[PDB]
Structures are given as C-alpha cells and as structure tokens.
Design a protein around this ligand. Sequence first.
Ligand SMILES: Nc1nc2c(ncn2[C@@H]2O[C@H](COP(=O)(O)OP(=O)(O)OP(=O)(O)O)[C@@H](O)[C@H]2O)c(=O)[nH]1
Ligand SMILES: Nc1nc2c(ncn2[C@@H]2O[C@H](COP(=O)(O)OP(=O)(O)OP(=O)(O)O)[C@@H](O)[C@H]2O)c(=O)[nH]1
Lengths: 246, 246
Amino acid sequence: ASMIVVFVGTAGSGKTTLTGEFGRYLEDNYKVAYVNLDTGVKELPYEPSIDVREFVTVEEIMREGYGPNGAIVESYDRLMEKFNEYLNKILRLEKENDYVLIDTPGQMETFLFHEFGVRLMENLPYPLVVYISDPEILKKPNDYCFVRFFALLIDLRLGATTIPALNKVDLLSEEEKERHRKYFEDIDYLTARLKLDPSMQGLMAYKMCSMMTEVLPPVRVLYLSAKTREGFEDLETLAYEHYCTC
Amino acid sequence: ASMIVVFVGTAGSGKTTLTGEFGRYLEDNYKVAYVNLDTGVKELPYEPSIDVREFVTVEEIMREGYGPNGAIVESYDRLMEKFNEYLNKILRLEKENDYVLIDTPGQMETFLFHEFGVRLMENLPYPLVVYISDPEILKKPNDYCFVRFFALLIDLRLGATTIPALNKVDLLSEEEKERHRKYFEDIDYLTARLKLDPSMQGLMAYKMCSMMTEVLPPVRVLYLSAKTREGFEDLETLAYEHYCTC
Ligand SMILES: Nc1nc2c(ncn2[C@@H]2O[C@H](COP(=O)(O)OP(=O)(O)OP(=O)(O)O)[C@@H](O)[C@H]2O)c(=O)[nH]1
Ligand SMILES: Nc1nc2c(ncn2[C@@H]2O[C@H](COP(=O)(O)OP(=O)(O)OP(=O)(O)O)[C@@H](O)[C@H]2O)c(=O)[nH]1
C-alpha cells in the first residue's frame, strides 16, 4: 500500500492541522500513519506512530540553559543519535500502510539545513513533499514567484517532488481566491506581469521565474483547507499519480 | 557616509560573531552602528544602537504560555507595533554613520516570512545583504547549487543585492578550501559536474543552476572568518562597489 506524504511549511501555515485533517479524510479508504518530527510543537491533533518529543523536546533543553534558537538546533543534533532507528521505524510504517503522513519541524529551516531532516528525507522511497503557504504572504506579483521558487529549492534540497499549496483558502473572499489562481495557473500572465516594475528589482524579478518556467513544466498549485476539506481529492490523486510516474 | 550591511544566515552560521568582528575591522577607518533584530539571541559580542530585546524577548513570551516555535512568531508580531519607530531609528543611524551593520533573526525564516523583517528591508536605501553558510552544508555538487539558489531567493524576497559567503573558513583544511572554491568560482565546471548523477534528481538538478547561470552574471562567493579576518577587505570593497553601482 506504501506511500509517504511530507508536509513542509513555515511557522503559522497550519500544516499540523492539515496533516491531521487530511489523515481522517484518508482514514476512510486507507490505512494511515502519522509521523511527528517537530520537537517544539505543544499539542498535536492526531495519533502519532512516531513522535520525536518522547526522545527530546525544545523546552527540556531550555530547562538546561539554551537560548531558544540554540535549543531547536540542539534538539535536532540529539535526534541524529537515533537517526538510524527513526529511519527504520518509518520504513516499517511505510509498508504497513497506505499512507504515512509526515509532519516536519515548524522552523522549516531545521528541515532544510540540519542533517536529520535532510538525510532522513533522502533515504525514503520517493516521498511526496507538500509545501504549504499562508496565502497572506501573497500581496503582489513578487510574492508569487518566490513561492514557486522556494518550492523548487526545497525540492532540490530534499530530492523529492515538492508540490506548492495554499492552506486556509476557506478564509479567502472569492475576491482573493480569484486573484491568486490567475497569478498562479496562467503562467503567461504573471510571467508577463513581471515587467510593470521598473527598478533594479522590478526587472531581474522578471527574468527569474521566466526561465525556471522554461526548463521543466511547472506544477499545479493546490488550494487546501483543513476546515472545509477543499483540495483533499486533488492531493489524494496527486499522491497516486506520483506513486505511478516514478 | 551612509551604508547598510545586512547579515543573513541560519542558526549556527556564526554571523553574530562575524557582525561583531567585521565591525571592529571597520571601526578603524569608519564610524559604525550595530542593529540587532533577533529576539531570542542571549548575549551579543557588540554594542547595539538598536536591540529589539529591550522591547521583547522570546523567553518573556514563553513565560506566558507559548510553544517555542509560537513565541518567535509572537515576538515578531509585537515588534511590528513599533515598526515605524524602528525604521526611523535605522534611517537616522544610516546617515550618522559610514556603516550600519544589521544582525537579523537566527531563524532566517522570521526574516524571510514575517512582515517586520520583510517590510523593514524593503524600506531601506539599497541595503547590502550577506548570506553566510556553514561550509559543512557543503558535502557534494548538490549542496553548492542550493546555496547560489537560496541567495537568489533571499535577494528576490528582500529586494536587496544578496552576496553568498562561507564563514569559519579558518576551520577548513586547505584540502576542503581547495574543494569549495573549485565548485564555486569555476562556473563551467560545477555547471558540468551536475550530470554524473543519473536519477530523477540527478538530472533536474543540472538544468537548475544551468539557467539561473545564464540570465544575470552570477556573483563571487566571499570566504570569511571572524577569527582570522579572512575576507573583510573583500566585503569592504564589495560594500563600496555596491554603493557605487546602484
Ligand atoms: N479557517 C481555517 N483555519 C485553520 C485552517 N487550518 C488551521 N487553522 C487554524 O490555524 C491554526 C493552525 O495550527 P497548526 O495546524 O498546528 O499550524 P502549524 O503549521 O503546525 O504551525 P507551525 O508549527 O508553527 O508551523 C489552528 O489552530 C486552526 O485553528 C484552515 O484550513 N482554515
Ligand atoms: N573558528 C572559528 N569559529 C567561529 C568563527 N565565527 C564564530 N565562531 C564560533 O562559533 C560561534 C558562533 O556564534 P554566533 O556568531 O553568535 O552564531 P550565530 O550566527 O549568531 O548563531 P544563530 O543566532 O543561531 O544564527 C561563536 O561562539 C564562536 O566561538 C570563525 O570565524 N572561526
């Protein structure tokens, strides 16, 4: 049955709530496992098969003299001592299930930059990555290219197909909803909207997502909502489509 | 005299030690101001003109019930209430000095993603960004393209020339020192080293920094060391060169 979905997203994207809700959505026609890799998240809305807080939490470490930024890094360093264990735990789940959903660190960068996250990921069988954004980071043509770009970066970094998505689209007025898809799905509209800006940066910014766009056929952005279950069917089949075309 | 240098880098890059040391290096032929924007860093090796911890620290906030990841975000939300104040504080320093050095959050992403960092930056006069990496993230041809890429991303994000650099090169055996420059400065060697990898990712990865490379003449990577002062003269003149060509 075997299939892994990694939720990546920055502090305040609501991806722990998504991981939870998307699981129950799956729990109806599928066996599902939940993996928590975040050492500093308080509560979790699901039942974890693997929960690294058992082994170490950011606070325990602070309760030993570390500045907050230094205690996240230090939680991930200690995790690596159980590196092989956690890998093999995950590999077991992978083929005892249809879906293993993986919830990554809230500081996205202790997943991009620390050894644990990075090595873990590059030793899993063709995992699917979902990069979710608060659609608020989306104010103007600039905000849109950065998101495609950063998804490309994560992909590069983890060596895993990374699909970009917006979460909490149920909070969007159709006003905004309209505005975002246009900019996202009509490549040759945004790719041309990046010229009405005449400044050191209102020019480069244009030749940026201009190429990345002309190399490997870009991806569809997912619109998701833990609250309405908008987009679950889509991601469901993107998962399956991914399991095929690999 | 006016000139701003923003040090960006992830938890464990040693850029607070760099900001400190590069300042004294400058303090000999220049008037210099130090700006700390990190709410969770304990001690600082310099004298801050602006220190946001006066107004709020990550711990005070934790001492009120926030999970660590939620207390960084919450420190930056409260900062934005003094947004205009901090902007004007910085603008005053800018032309009371030759250099204002700015030390950004240790969680690089509360600078890329929160409103404070991002808006602050895009309202400063042509600031220079220095992206520093622990050269350990550098193991193989992949690690190298990601770094160029991510510097491009920051640049895009903040609308500021962003220069990539390695810090702590004094810890490098000449063995490694040799190895990194080759991969970094001989474009058409790494840009061709990205083909001896035959896998979903050992192929895309090649067409990645292949284009970005063919659009706008790439940048020289700086090798820096707070401990030996390797690279200071270089960055010094890159600062000046930047102040010119703008
Ligand atoms: N309206 C709406 N609210 C949501 C949705 N998803 C999450 N929320 C709310 O926003 C909060 C997000 O919480 P989490 O899912 O834990 O966020 P997170 O991504 O784990 O946060 P970090 O760990 O910092 O990355 C929840 O408490 C929900 O109340 C959504 O789809 N729609
Ligand atoms: N050998 C050597 N050691 C260094 C150098 N720079 C910093 N260090 C050491 O590494 C540590 C880095 O500390 P910081 O400069 O505060 O690191 P930082 O970038 O502020 O860390 P974050 O806030 O998490 O991003 C220091 O305590 C130094 O002892 C260097 O250039 N060479």
